[model samples]
Target: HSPASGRYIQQMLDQRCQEIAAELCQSGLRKMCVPSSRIVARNAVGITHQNTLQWRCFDTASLLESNQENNGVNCVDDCGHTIPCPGGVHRQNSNHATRHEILSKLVEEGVQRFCSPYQASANKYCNDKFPGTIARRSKGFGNNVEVAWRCYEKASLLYSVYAECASNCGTTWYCPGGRRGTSTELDKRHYTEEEGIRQAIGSVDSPCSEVEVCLPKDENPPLCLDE
Candidate 1:
């Protein structure tokens, strides 16, 4: 046989081996869908580029057999401590209506921190009504109040920064002589203020405005808030 023909045959055999290995790995993964006490640990026996590619599944369940004391138990606390099951005796009527009312009031008032009376009350109501749920104060207060407060704070910071920039750079600051064809006095000073605010907020990944486009040639803008 010619040398080229022998090399082609070897390549075909390598491809076929890789395909078989991939199929076997996929089949093993599919078999792991069954719910059981067994845990399968899969490992590639050899490198992918090698024709001797193989895999093996080691059952690790035997190693964990001694630690299965709470195997059938369910009601565990945050620290994984087993608590007494109330067995439906502690079940009470849901205060969904009251919870909704309080949530609406909180939303309308734009409650930020938990210091205000309404905000504190809303936090308490959420905690009492939604125990073990993410709606509690320690979690996020239904993922609303804290997020809203952060957004409000960021917006206020941005506005203040922009105001400071406007005062320093002036609203009708020119964009250099030849940069802007006819509209030399474009109100782009606000862009510099926004860039400064983003930098102060420690948003380092955010892009800043180009020079002579937002700020003056030698002017160094100040941030309303510190970094």
Candidate 2:
């Protein structure tokens, strides 16, 4: 490939990467791995970098719910012996401590390592777009119990518009312009997912009401608004 071709390929790759990132994020998955890049050479021609990104879906809400149930104050067993609270009197505290430890570790890992790899590629196409703003707004979550929830919401909104444009206009490329003609009519015509996506995006500014036992604190901490 020539330099122009290489640039073109990179541009296409960046666009594709943003789409995939938004899709994965909207689907409640974290971009846990970076896109791996390697040089590819054609016969007697120039080389180009081929990139592929990876993702993992984590039900963080379910995880937190399970941990909450497990860490609940269980004073008795199935037999109701109540002997030292079975697993131990301090079992709830211990469980909470362990859960916080794991949560902190994963958050640190996600923010420091996992998210960046995906962000680097996504930034190419999405950095200046709506996804970037959503991501920036999510900073208010501040490594709390709602961080993943906020991330999911932002990514979901990003992908909803993206998928809408792709479906209506048949291409995500230059969709902002392509989608401007009778697109709302088309969305109303195919009103299931489109309606749902619109509703989801509209709800982005609403406060998250789900409360979880936040770490390093006693009372259940409230989630921050993404505004």
Candidate 3:
């Protein structure tokens, strides 16, 4: 175990944080992952990107933690096995989290990826998975949502009439603003599955609102379903 100078920490963070973060999101236990937290002695915030209202970008992304025993830099897994990183390690008995801790962390991360796909694309993300779930939304972020949350049908994309897009809400829904048809999509954004994954691996900065992951699509469902 060894201590990492500030220079090494910065370099590793800049180059590998995103890639490693992606792996961590996709992995389960024992899959060689990195966590952003540890002992409360120090917060050790990492580099953050984006920082937009809609996109909160990496909030304190850390690939290593301080070793309680020696204060060196190193990465640790769920099993307490150490992977060589810049920091030192403390035994898992002290560092390992309880079940509640793991669940709490997952719920927090859940929203970040959920909204990633809603970045307004070719409509594949929207049309592919939740074909039944139509987003009859307005043209803004956050609050623009109430207008967008109506559940709809398959032809909802082809202007198949309100029958396709406007199911229960009808014309008099509490949601303000907006009509259906091709123009509706042109006015707003949408989400998909694979496209969502790309967004998923990158950002941890969005609020898990329908505005983020549940927006409407731009194109018809299945635009080659590009990955």
lDDT of 1 by residue, 1-227 (tens): 21010112212222333343345556774433332233221111211222221222222322222211121111211111111221111012100011223222332332221112222232233334434211111111122122111111110121101111111222221110011112222211111122322232332211223333322111223122323
CA lDDT, every model vs. true structure: 0.21, 0.21, 0.27
lDDT score of model 2?
A: 0.21
What would the TM-scores of all predictions be?
0.13, 0.16, 0.16
Which candidate has the highest lDDT of all? 3
Cα RMSD for candidate 2?
24.4
Candidate 2 clashing pairs, residues 3+ apart or interchain: none
lDDT of 3 by residue, 98-206 (tens): 2223333433443232211322221233434555333433322233323333323322222211211111111121111133434454333443233343332234322
